[PDB]
Design a protein around this ligand. Structure first.
Ligand SMILES: *[C@@H]1O[C@H](CO)[C@@H](O)[C@H](O)[C@H]1NC(C)=O
Ligand SMILES: N[C@@H](CCC(=O)O)C(=O)O
Lengths: 424, 61
C-alpha cells in the first residue's frame, strides 16, 4: 500500500518499529531512498530524481528559459520542486516566480495563485509538480479568469480525464508525463463482468455503482451494465500486480528455504520472522513480469535502495471535435519526441510559444549583465566610432577609421582636398 | 543628475545613467530636457530661462 507519498512516509515511520515489510506501488518521493530511516520500505516505481531531469530537458529542447513553478505542500511536491530547481540551474534556466498550494485552499486562494502567475508576463510557461485535485482546481480557476498558459505537468496530473473535465479550453495544448506501462488484457474482461448482485465481497462497490450509473438501489439499477459502456484502463494497474506478485515470490522463496519437506506451513515459518524476509528475500526477487505482452522483456527487481527503473512517456492534450490525449515521445537516459504530432509545433501553425526574460540585443548594441546573471541582460549601444568586438566589449575602431557595416571590422576613411570643380 | 534603469529580475539592484547637461530629472527613473532657451534648475526638476546676451560697453572688445 501507499499511493500518496505522505501516506507512505507516515505509515513507514510506524511499521519500522514492529519490523513489518512494506511495498508501495505509486509513491515516487525521493526521501524514501534513505535506508537509515526507512529501513523496511520498497517500491516498484522509480524515484522523482529522474522526473525532474526529464522535465528540465523538455524545457531546454524548446528554448524556454524563463519559467514559473507551482508546488503542492507536502513531501512529494516540495522535494520534486527542489530537485527540478537544482536540475534547471544546471542548464541555464531561470525561475520567474514560485507558488505553493496548501492542504486546505479555497477558490479565492486558487484565483490569487493564478493572478500571481500573471504578474510576470514574460514567463508564459507554468511548471506544475502537484497532486491531481490541486491541478483540477487550478485549471478551473484559470478557465474562470480567462487566462492562457502552457502547462508542463508531472505524473500527478498524468493522463486523467477527470482533471480536464469541463476545462477543455484552458487545458488544451498541455504537456504531461506518465510512467511507462502497458495494459493487461485479462483485467479488462474481469472488470467488465462485475455487477453489484454478485460482487458482494467488496463493501464499496454499490456506492461506486450508484455514482457511475446514477441510480438508487432503494430501484432502476439493473438495466445498466459495465459491458455496454467503454472501458479505459488506468495507467498504474501494472505496478499493483507487480507489487503483489513480488511479495508472493518473496514468501515462496522463504518457504522453500525454511520448510524443505512440506508444502504446508511449518513451525519455523509460523510467525514468518520479519527482519529476515526483508533483508534477504524481498530485495533479491527476480522473475518475468506476469500478463506482459509476449514481445516485451519486462522483469521485476529492486536495486540497493529498493527502487524501480526510470522510464517515462510524454503526452499532449489536443482537439480532434472531441478532445483526447496523444503520446509524442519518451525519456530513458535521453529525450526523444516527434514534433509532427504536436499541433502548435507543426509548421504553418505560427511561431512557437515563447518564454524568455530578455529579447536579443541589436547589431550595434552590447549586452550588460550584473556579475553571475546568466539569463537576463541590458542592451547598451556602442559609440558611433566603436565597433562591437564581442558581447560585452565595444572596441574603438581607430584614428581615421570607421566601423564596418558588420560592426566587426574597420575601414579607412577617404581623404579630402579642394577639388578642381568646387565653387571655391 | 543620474537616473535609474532597473535590471530585470532584481528590484534592489539598478543601473545609474547620467543625463545630458540640458536635461532635467522629472521623475526618479527618467529625465527630460528643458525647452530651447531654458536650462535645468539646480534641483534638476525645473527650467530657468537663459539670460539674453549682447555686447556691452565695458567689454575689452
Ligand atoms: C533553440 O535554439 C537553438 C540555438 O538558436 C536552435 O539551434 C534550436 O533550433 C532552437 N530550438 C527550437 C525548437 O526553437
Ligand atoms: N506518485 C504520486 C502518486 C500519484 C498517483 O497515484 O499516480 C505521489 O507520490 O503522490
Amino acid at each position: 500500500g501507499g499511493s500518496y507519498s505522505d501516506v507512505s512516509i507516515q505509515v513507514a515511520n510506524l511499521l519500522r518499529l514492529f519490523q513489518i515489510p512494506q511495498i508501495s506501488y505509486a509513491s515516487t518521493s525521493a526521501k524514501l531512498s534513505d535506508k537509515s530511516r526507512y529501513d523496511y520500505f520498497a517500491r516498484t516505481v522509480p524515484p522523482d530524481f529522474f522526473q525532474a531531469k526529464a522535465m528540465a530537458e523538455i524545457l531546454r529542447f524548446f528554448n524556454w528559459t524563463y519559467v514559473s513553478t507551482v508546488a503542492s505542500e507536502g513531501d512529494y511536491g516540495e522535494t520534486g520542486i527542489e530537485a527540478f530547481e537544482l536540475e534547471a540551474r544546471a542548464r541555464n534556466i531561470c525561475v520567474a516566480t514560485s507558488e505553493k498550494v496548501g492542504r486546505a485552499m479555497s477558490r479565492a486562494a486558487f484565483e490569487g495563485v493564478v493572478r500571481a502567475l500573471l504578474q510576470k508576463p514574460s514567463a508564459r510557461v507554468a511548471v506544475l509538480f502537484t497532486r491531481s485535485e490541486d491541478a483540477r482546481e487550478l485549471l478551473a480557476a484559470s478557465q474562470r479568469l480567462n487566462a492562457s498558459f502552457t502547462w508542463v505537468a508531472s505524473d500527478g496530473w498524468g493522463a486523467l480525464e477527470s482533471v480536464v473535465a469541463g476545462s477543455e479550453g484552458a487545458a488544451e495544448g498541455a504537456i504531461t508525463i506518465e510512467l511507462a506501462s502497458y495494459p493487461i488484457s485479462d483485467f479488462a474482461s474481469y472488470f467488465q463482468s462485475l455487477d453489484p448482485w454478485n460482487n458482494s465481497r467488496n463493501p464499496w462497490f454499490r456506492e461506486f455503482w450508484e455514482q457511475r450509473f446514477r441510480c438508487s438501489f432503494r430501484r432502476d439499477c439493473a438495466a445498466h451494465s459495465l459491458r455496454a459502456v467503454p472501458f479505459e484502463q488506468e495507467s498504474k494497474i501494472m505496478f499493483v500486480v507487480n507489487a503483489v506478485y513480488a511479495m508472493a515470490h518473496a514468501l515462496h522463496n522463504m518457504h522453500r528455504a525454511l520448510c524443505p519437506n512440506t508444502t504446508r506451513l511449518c513451525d519455523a515459518m509460523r510467525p514468518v520472522n520479519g527482519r529476515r524476509l526483508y533483508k534477504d528475500f524481498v530485495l533479491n526477487v527476480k522473475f518475468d513480469a506476469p500478463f506482459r505482452p509476449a514481445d516485451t522483456h519486462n522483469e521485476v527487481r529492486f536495486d540497493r535502495f529498493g527502487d524501480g527503473i526510470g522510464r517515462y512517456n510524454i503526452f499532449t492534450y489536443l482537439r480532434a471535435g472531441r478532445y483526447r490525449y496523444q503520446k509524442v515521445g519518451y525519456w530513458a537516459e535521453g529525450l526523444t519526441l516527434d514534433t509532427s504530432l504536436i499541433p502548435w509545433a507543426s509548421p504553418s501553425a505560427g511561431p512557437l510559444p515563447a518564454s524568455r526574460c530578455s529579447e536579443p540585443c541589436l547589431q550595434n548594441e552590447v549586452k550588460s549583465v550584473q556579475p553571475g546573471e546568466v539569463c537576463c541582460w541590458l542592451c547598451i549601444p556602442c559609440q558611433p566610432y566603436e565597433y562591437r568586438l564581442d558581447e560585452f566589449t565595444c572596441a574603438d575602431c581607430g584614428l581615421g577609421y570607421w566601423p564596418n557595416a558588420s560592426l566587426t571590422g574597420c575601414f579607412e576613411l577617404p581623404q579630402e582636398y579642394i577639388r578642381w570643380g568646387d565653387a571655391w
